[PDB]
Design a protein around this nucleic acid. Structure first.
Ligand SMILES: [Zn+2]
Ligand SMILES: [Zn+2]
Lengths: 579, 689, 542
DNA sequence: AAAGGTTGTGGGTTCGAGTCCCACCAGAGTCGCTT
DNA sequence: AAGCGACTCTGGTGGGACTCGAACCCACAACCTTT
């Protein structure tokens, strides 16, 4: 227990776990990531076909302009203007606080950061999916298989010199005929290489490997080129939204050779890559409750077949019936990848040993849960709940030990609404969570090697990032015609006097007492939250929701001299290794 | 042909572990479940008219105490566990805290005391003529169970306890020169000492020859412990040896025994399959028995390392029609496929062919069973598909042809967690669960065991008439199909009667008289247990006549052995003169062979009485009648149906069907009747226990 | 079953309180099927050795000597009219041999009743060595301890004796439900009547016994029959018979065996018609018996009432002719379950939906749908109205968008206001004075009106009849019970909105219960209740 | 004239509903010892 | 003094079991009810 106050205004015993998580995450990635993997799966220009304006029209999300909104920033003068931005466009970053907002044309339902090796100093990208229609909603029990667009957004390099005046750029998108995408996961490492890498004209330098959980019941794997390499091949006069039709590296689906009998598994709902080198396994969760594993390199004629177009179809090597209901979320253990956790709509969290799948390590029955986060250093998992079964006033976010330490669940944050999505920053040891209330909070967990019951007041360890309010001005147009989004951002520059600043009072008056609204579209609701996995930009967060606005925030107060120290040393090491 | 049999069997607890249903040669069905092993005992009940399967239910309780694998002293292990749990490295600390092998119980971890796997021994392994049950918990307690009385299973031995001590005594070294005294404080050695004795799966050998049976236990590190049990198995006393062989297979998933005969030369090995896909037969290089011998060198059946886990293995003896020789067919479940390999000794040695029969299922195979008499495979997946898979001989090796059996048509939308097949292929037993209802999940989950007829009555009747094994208890599942028909239609089908009379006329061996007695007793139950009264009296007269014939043949055989061994002048344990009188009583006794036998005996018999006394009176029992003896004071003593001595002891043995009674052997009995008293019942061929 | 096993079975068919030695011999002598071996002192010593040498049997000294058993035989099994009557013929209900005292929550899981379970002491090791050699003869044991020697079979043997060989040992039962089984078990072939179990064995509400009996029916350990008790009144009472499956026999009834003969008679007569007198005379039956059979055949729907002239059977002659919603919700990925549940209730609108109908529509467990309803009420987005239908005061849930306009709201609000009026209009031979939902408030208001307009009303039947017709005019299918009225009248008595006055008047050798209901403004001394008593006594007069 | 379908009665059956009350939870308080 | 880590002390809710209130059903006597 370390005394005194950090210069950011949090007590040192509250910040000390955050500073420890930097070293633990670095020591892990040095051992169990790698600089290059899947060397065959590299992008080819002839596999990327640019759609004309006429061909792209079915795929673009159908709202051409955002709802009207205004952003108020804590302690700055009131803006008072209402912004509205075109689809695939961004406001400019605020010059002091560097928040960026851009609009994707539909409700955002998948989102991931493109992972980049430490010290690379690359341009930072997010890949996301936004549904075609703001008001249509899809059943779980049925395959959809409509059109949809996978969108790749570049955020810049997010250096301090780059953030003033930054804007998000829609660099390209892939027109998918495979329905809506329920999850996105990039290959955790070894997928990225320098955009300057010399490669022959058919080939393109690789930006990443991206797996899509489709509502068509299959997983799609793409290898992504760097944008400049496509635009060098693209005609110079091409349409400015670069929409491509792209061949998969592989389609991943449940089945067997010559087994014409269509699988009962239904929609694919969630993904996890194997966290550790060589990342050779990918898992998916299915509506029937099975968890399904594919051995991505597999040569075996019983698992791999090559289609006439040259793409692979991969059948799984292992499947087991994890849940008695749709398995909504997976997390695969980083510290030892023999272990995995899953949660399903039977509202059990089940820990698994993948060597011994016949019985879970531990099943804890809980409330219905939407997403899980497994922070590297902590043995347990933090859970986001759907509120429909929680006791009123006890719904929220819980950390749950996997069982050996035997602690009770730690109530890291009360929330009134359902927390739709959750992300744990390994670098920060902090967690961020989006609510149908339209509020984004962050919370610092204690060192969960130590019994949480000593945490006398967890409210000192959490803060809001922003809240969206509808201000008057059950369907989208009837809502947009009569409301605008007031985004109330906090001053993340420091946490001094936190519990007396208005956003904490506003949040604390939200918690416990506030009543959910059901006579509206939930236009303020936030659907995905993602901390950056990259050491560069490690302090950055992205979020988006029903509005189809996507917003980026830098949590300046959790960035620290150790992260700067580690960024500089990693830059030096990276610059020595690659030149 | 496939239709449901009427009783669904409700299970109180969640089905648990690997491949959880099995059907023993003893017609006991075990399901491994989270709180017990439930055992379903199929009785061909001759005392009741109910058409259902008469399933007697028993269970093995789950253990009350969580098993800890011994890896060191009680103090040194405690400081090591503290060291690893407190480790600041995420990998070491979380590897310790997640792996349940190191943590069989904890403050907030559910106890893993339910059952991981079960295997049934051959018959004759128990202290009675019955089979033993090997049971493995998920906390790695391996135990051998027997049902000595009918009511309660007792643990005969814990093999994990013994093996842990023997490893400790050898400091966890198999070869004392080969390894250091590696420090338990090293996580690799700590993990190894757990891994080297965590049992994966287990199988019994056949009966070696005094009888003996082996048990091979597979450990996570690829060691195999081959236990040798003396028979009848009564506990630790009967464990003749334990020997560990190092397979070297990484992550071994499954094990089965290979046993084979060519030119009357016996051969055997262990076939072992990796979770990473390959399949290899080990030569069992170490054994003490002299009659068996072992394969000379390992053979690789599948080499590919494709990571399709070998979930199950089965093999069946066959005779190949075109290669005109006996061969062994191996079938193995690999993901959703069935691997099959045919092993054929010839002048070239082993000739080997293999393939994957493909397109069976769109999900991994959750269980597999082999019809030992035909090699018919059944395979199953949690989508509720079951596929019958018929081996068809080919000029070289085989082809497999297969067909789905629509459980949808008999049970509706269903999930299947396991299958088993009766020893003659008469029934398929299925662990059914509520299926997806038009794409909705079922709200509540309730496991059951359900049965379907694999064979028509006419095929069961024919196979019983042409039975090579000629013991009814080996065929309870076929005579149950015959029983169901007779109880349903209240008459014996004429073709079966006519064919049985022809067999009795042309062959007349006591098997066919036992088969006749079964049909007539089930007929009597069928007709509501005064033309019906006249018919009841008629067929009960027929039952009594054939019951009397079987008695005559057994009495003749008993006296036909009293004559062979040294004359028991003291009449010590057989009512010899009473039996001789009973075999001369009637002019029905036209059999000259019995008459001359009792002639020679009565010439040799002592003139001294040596009578049998009622213990409550010390007064004689006259030997008037087959079933029971009475004294003047009116006591009634049953007679041992194997030796006709009166069962005056406070404990004596009873047939599985309670149709017959037998005495316990005593040290005063000579060896030859101590062997005679091990005969099955003369009427039902069931164990008299 | 073997003699030696039939002994141990009988020892296990008593409960955890077991047998005395004289009880054991009595049980064996009364066994069915008959005990194979005739009891005599040497035989009884042999059977005693069979107990002492058995490791599952155990022996205790209880602090006081137990009563000896009665002749248990429950049933008459004779008649003077055609056939026989096997109705219950009551023995004297002497002090029970086995008064029940459940061994609740036992840490070893042993279950049953024993009044001395904590007080009796084991004497196993006195009766036998630990090597199971018997230390005492039966005569020594009965000399030393007498009736205090109690023999009990192990729980494994006792539970086996209740479920038989086909029964599953893994099934745990609640202690109260297990004690029902062993109360049945010790009755052997003549099961306890459910009436008697709750009345005098368990001494509980019939609802309690039914509720605890449910699990035994659900798992199928017992068999249900209707059975008939012949009272000393000569009248006979219906009650349920419970038989443990081992002991099930399909019990017949006099009216059943006689209606079978009539069914055979009429079905074999080619016309399927005969006159009642010949239907009687061919069976020798009296009209008092036969008219039950006639109406049973009619109520069974097997025959039809017919009349034909004698020239038509060949004057009118009586004859008998024989003759024999809510659609399921597809859960969407993109909304929380509280939102989706409100979307359901909005679609129902003015009519609402029940918690059970939500559960089926949402495909959720009972506890899960309960929490949905609780939260939506607490959020004030949905409002719950009680509705009585069938036997059940369900709740129907309506969104606050529609709730005020709903028929349930409007009807309830009317009857609440009407109740407030009808209460506020209240004024500022040996008689004794006795101690929400739309339909319930309607019934309350209608009674309050009646006592306001008719300051005396002469019987509870008058209240029921007007209520029944009022509800029938409304079209209610359910028929109001007497108990519901008298409990309702009791509620109004505690609210002080009426007096109910009860007595029995006596006249010309007969007696009548009066049950006068009157407005609170009068006491039992009022000439009006006296006039009512007199005018009842008049019409009761011969 | 000359009698039976039609009904009310005391009590048990039973059906699904809402209620119980204990264990557990989240928060705030106590205070022996340290800093 | 100011602070910490057990150790309590205080209001609130749900899980399964179970009280609850109702209609439904027997078989009888009452007689209203009918040619
Ligand atoms: Zn005698
Ligand atoms: Zn027998």
């Amino acid at each position: 227990h370390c005394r005194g106050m950090a210069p950011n205004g949090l007590p040192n015993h509250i910040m000390a776990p955050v500073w420890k998580c930097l070293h633990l995450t670095k020591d892990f990635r040095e051992q169990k990531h790698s600089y290059w993997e899947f060397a065959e799966w590299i992008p080819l220009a002839w596999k990327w076909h640019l759609l004309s304006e006429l061909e792209a029209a079915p795929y673009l999300p159908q709202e051409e302009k955002s709802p009207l909104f205004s952003v108020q920033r804590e302690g700055l003068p009131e803006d008072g203007t209402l912004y509205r931005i075109n689809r695939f466009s961004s406001i400019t970053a605020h010059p002091e606080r560097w928040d960026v907002s851009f609009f994707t044309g539909g409700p955002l339902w998948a989102l991931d950061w493109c992972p980049v090796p430490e010290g690379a100093g690359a341009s930072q990208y997010v890949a996301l999916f936004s549904s075609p229609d703001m008001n249509e909603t899809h059943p779980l029990s049925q395959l959809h298989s409509g059109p949809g667009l996978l969108q790749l957004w570049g955020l810049g390099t997010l250096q301090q010199e780059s953030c003033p005046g930054n804007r998000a750029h829609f660099v390209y998108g892939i027109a998918c005929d495979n329905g809506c995408i329920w999850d996105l996961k990039f290959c955790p490492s070894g997928a990225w290489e320098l955009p300057g890498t010399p490669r022959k004209a058919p080939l393109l330098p690789r930006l990443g490997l991206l797996a899509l959980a489709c509502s068509d019941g299959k997983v799609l794997l793409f290898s992504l080129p760097h944008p400049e390499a496509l635009l060098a091949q693209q005609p110079p006069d091409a349409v400015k939204p670069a929409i491509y039709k792209v061949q998969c590296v592989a389609t991943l689906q449940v089945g067997s050779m010559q087994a014409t009998d269509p699988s009962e598994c239904g929609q694919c709902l969630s993904l996890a890559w194997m966290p550790t080198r060589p990342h050779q396994h990918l898992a998916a969760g299915y509506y029937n409750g099975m968890v399904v594993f594919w051995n991505l390199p597999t040569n075996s004629p019983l698992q791999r077949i090559r289609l006439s177009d040259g793409s692979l179809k991969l059948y799984p090597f292992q499947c087991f019936l994890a849940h008695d209901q749709a398995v909504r979320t997976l997390q695969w253990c980083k510290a030892n990848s023999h272990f995995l956790v899953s949660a399903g709509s039977d509202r059990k969290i089940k820990f698994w040993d993948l060597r011994r799948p016949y019985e879970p390590i531990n099943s804890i029955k809980r409330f219905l849960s939407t997403e899980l986060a497994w922070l590297l250093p902590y043995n347990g998992v933090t859970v986001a709940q759907d509120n429909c079964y929680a006791s009123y006033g006890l719904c929220g976010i819980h950390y749950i030990d996997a069982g050996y330490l035997g602690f009770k669940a730690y109530f890291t944050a009360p929330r009134k609404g359902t927390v739709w999505s959750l992300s744990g920053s390994d670098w920060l040891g902090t967690i961020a969570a989006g609510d149908i209330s339209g509020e984004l909070i962050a919370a610092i967990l204690p060192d969960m090697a130590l019994n949480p019951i000593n945490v006398k007041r967890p409210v000192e360890r959490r803060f809001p990032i922003y809240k969206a309010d509808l201000i008057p001005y059950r369907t989208y147009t009837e809502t947009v015609n009569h409301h605008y989004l007031l985004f109330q951002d906090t001053d993340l520059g420091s946490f001094h006097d936190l519990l007396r600043r208005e956003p904490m009072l506003r949040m604390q008056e939200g918690e416990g007492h506030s009543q959910l609204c059901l006579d509206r579209l939930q236009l303020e609701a936030i659907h995905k939250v993602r901390f950056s996995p990259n050491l560069d930009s490690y302090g950055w967060l992205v979020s988006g929701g029903q509005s189809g606005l996507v917003r980026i925030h830098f949590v300046r107060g959790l960035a620290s001299p150790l992260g700067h120290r580690m960024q500089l040393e990693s830059r030096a090491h990276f610059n020595a290794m690659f030149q | 042909m496939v239709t449901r049999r009427e009783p669904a069997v409700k299970l109180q607890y969640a089905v648990s572990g690997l491949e959880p249903l099995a059907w023993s040669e003893d017609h006991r069905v075990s399901v491994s479940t989270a709180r017990s092993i439930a055992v379903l005992e199929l009785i061909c009940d001759v005392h009741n008219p109910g058409q259902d399967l008469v399933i007697h239910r028993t269970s093995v309780p789950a253990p009350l105490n969580s098993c800890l694998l011994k890896v060191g002293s009680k103090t040194e292990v405690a400081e090591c566990k503290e060291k690893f749990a407190a480790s600041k490295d995420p990998t070491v600390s979380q590897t310790f805290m997640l792996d349940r092998v190191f943590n069989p119980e904890g403050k907030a971890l559910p106890p893993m005391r339910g059952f991981k796997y079960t295997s049934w021994s051959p018959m004759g392994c128990d202290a009675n003529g019955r089979c033993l049950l090997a049971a493995l918990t998920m906390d790695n307690r391996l135990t051998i169970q027997a049902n000595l009385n009918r009511l309660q299973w007792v643990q005969l031995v814990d093999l994990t306890e013994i093996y842990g001590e023997r490893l400790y005594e050898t400091s966890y070294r198999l070869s004392k020169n080969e390894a250091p005294e590696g420090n338990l404080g090293d996580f690799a050695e700590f993990q190894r000492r757990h891994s080297m004795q965590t049992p994966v799966r287990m199988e019994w050998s056949g009966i070696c020859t005094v009888g003996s049976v082996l048990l091979a236990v597979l450990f996570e590190n690829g060691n195999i412990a081959v236990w040798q049990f003396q028979l009848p198995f009564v506990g630790k006393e009967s464990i003749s040896s334990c020997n560990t062989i190092e397979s070297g297979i990484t992550s071994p998933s499954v094990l089965f025994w290979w046993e084979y005969e060519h030119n009357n030369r016996k051969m055997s090995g262990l076939i072992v399959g990796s979770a990473f896909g390959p399949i290899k037969i080990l030569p069992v290089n170490l054994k003490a028995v002299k009659g068996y011998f072992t394969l000379r060198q390992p053979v690789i059946l599948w080499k590919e390392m494709d990571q399709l886990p070998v979930h199950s293995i089965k093999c069946v003896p066959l005779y190949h029609p075109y290669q005109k020789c006996s061969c062994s067919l191996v079938v193995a479940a690999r993901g959703s496929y069935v691997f099959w390999c045919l092993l054929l000794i010839s002048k070239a040695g082993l000739n080997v062919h293999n393939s994957h029969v493909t397109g069976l299922h769109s999900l991994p195979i959750v269980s597999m069973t082999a019809d030992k008499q035909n090699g018919t495979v059944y395979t199953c997946s949690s989508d509720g598909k079951v596929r019958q898979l018929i081996p068809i001989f080919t000029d070289v090796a085989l082809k497999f042809e297969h067909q789905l059996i629509k459980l949808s048509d008999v049970f509706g939308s269903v999930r299947t967690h396991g299958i088993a097949v009766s020893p003659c292929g008469a029934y398929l037993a299925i662990i059914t669960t509520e299926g997806m209802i038009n794409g909705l999940h079922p709200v509540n989950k309730n496991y059951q065991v359900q049965f379907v007829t694999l064979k028509t009555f006419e095929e069961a009747a024919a196979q019983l008439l042409e039975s090579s094994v000629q013991n009814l208890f080996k065929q309870v599942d076929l005579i149950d199909l015959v029983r169901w028909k007779i109880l349903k239609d209240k008459h014996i089908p004429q073709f079966l009667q006519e064919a049985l009379e022809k067999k009795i006329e042309s062959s007349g061996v006591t098997y066919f008289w036992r088969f006749k007695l079964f049909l007539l007793r089930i007929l009597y139950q069928s007709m509501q247990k005064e033309p019906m009264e006249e018919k009841l009296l008629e067929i009960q007269g027929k039952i009594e006549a054939v019951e009397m014939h079987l008695t005559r043949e057994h009495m003749k055989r008993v006296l036909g052995e009293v004559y062979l061994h040294t004359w028991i002048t003291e009449n010590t344990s057989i009512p010899t003169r009473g039996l001789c009188n009973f075999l001369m009583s009637d002019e029905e006794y036209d059999d000259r062979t019995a008459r001359v036998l009792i002639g020679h005996i009565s010439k040799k018999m002592n003139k001294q009485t040596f009578p049998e006394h009622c213990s409550l009176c010390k007064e004689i029992l006259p030997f008037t009648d087959r079933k029971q003896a009475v004294c003047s004071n009116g006591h009634i003593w049953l007679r041992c149906f194997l030796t006709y001595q009166s069962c005056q002891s406070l404990i004596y043995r009873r047939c599985l069907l309670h149709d017959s009674i037998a005495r316990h052997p005593a040290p005063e009995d000579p060896d030859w009747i101590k062997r005679l008293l091990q005969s099955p019942c003369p009427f039902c061929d069931s164990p008299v226990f | 079953m073997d003699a030696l096993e039939s002994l141990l079975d009988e020892v296990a068919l008593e409960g955890l309180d077991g047998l005395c030695l004289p009880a054991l011999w009595s049980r064996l002598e009364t066994r069915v099927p008959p005990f194979p071996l005739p009891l005599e002192p040497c035989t009884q010593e042999f059977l005693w050795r069979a107990l002492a040498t058995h490791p599952g049997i155990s022996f205790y000294e209880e602090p006081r000597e137990r009563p000896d058993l009665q002749l248990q035989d429950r049933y008459e099994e004779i008649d003077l009219e055609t056939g026989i009557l096997e109705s219950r013929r009551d023995p004297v209900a002497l002090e029970d041999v086995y008064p029940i005292h459940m061994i609740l929550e036992n840490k070893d899981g042993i279950q049953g009743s024993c009044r001395y379970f904590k007080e009796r002491k084991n004497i196993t090791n006195d009766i036998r060595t630990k090597s199971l050699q018997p230390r005492c003869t039966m005569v020594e044991a009965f000399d030393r301890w007498g009736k205090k020697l109690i023999i009990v079979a192990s729980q494994a043997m006792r539970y086996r004796a209740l479920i038989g060989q086909e029964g599953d040992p893994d099934l745990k039962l609640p202690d109260f439900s297990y004690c029902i089984l062993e109360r049945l078990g010790r009755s052997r072939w003549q099961g306890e009547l459910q009436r008697d179990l709750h009345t005098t064995a368990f001494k509980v509400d019939a609802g309690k016994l039914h509720y605890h009996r449910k699990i035994l029916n659900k798992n199928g350990l017992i068999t249900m029959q209707s059975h008939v008790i012949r009272l000393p009144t000569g009248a006979q009472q219906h009650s349920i018979l419970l038989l443990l499956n081992r002991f099930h026999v399909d019990r017949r009834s006099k009216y059943d065996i006689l209606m079978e003969k009539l069914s055979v008679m009429l079905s074999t007569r080619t016309n399927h018609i005969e006159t009642l007198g010949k239907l009687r005379e061919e069976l020798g039956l009296c009209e008092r018996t036969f008219k039950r059979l006639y109406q049973y055949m009619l109520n069974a729907g097997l025959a039809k009432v017919v009349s034909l002239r004698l020239q038509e059977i060949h004057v009118m002659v009586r004859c008998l002719k024989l003759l024999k919603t809510v659609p399921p919700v597809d859960i969407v990925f993109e909304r929380d379950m509280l939102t989706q549940t409100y979307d359901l209730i909005e679609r129902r609108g003015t009519k609402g939906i029940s918690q059970a109908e939500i559960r089926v529509a949402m495909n959720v467990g009972k506890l899960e749908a309960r929490m949905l309803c609780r939260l939506l009420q607490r959020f004030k987005v949905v409002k719950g109205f009680m509705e009585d239908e069938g036997r059940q005061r369900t709740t129907k849930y309506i969104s606050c968008v529609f709730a005020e306009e709903s028929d349930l709201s409007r009807q309830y609000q009317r009857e609440k206001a009407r109740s407030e009026l009808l209460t506020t209009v209240s004024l500022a031979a040996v008689i004794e004075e006795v101690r929400e939902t739309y339909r319930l408030l309607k019934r309350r208001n209608l009674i309050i009106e009646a006592v306001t307009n008719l300051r005396l009303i002469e019987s509870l039947f008058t209240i029921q009849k007007m209520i029944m017709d009022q509800e029938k005019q409304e079209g209610v299918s359910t028929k109001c019970c007497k108990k519901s009225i008298v409990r309702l009248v009791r509620n109004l008595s505690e609210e002080g909105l009426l007096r109910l006055y009860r007595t029995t008047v006596i006249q010309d050798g007969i007696k009548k219960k009066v049950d006068l209901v009157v407005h609170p403004s009068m006491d039992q001394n009022d000439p009006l209740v006296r006039s009512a008593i007199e005018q009842v006594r008049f019409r009761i007069s011969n």
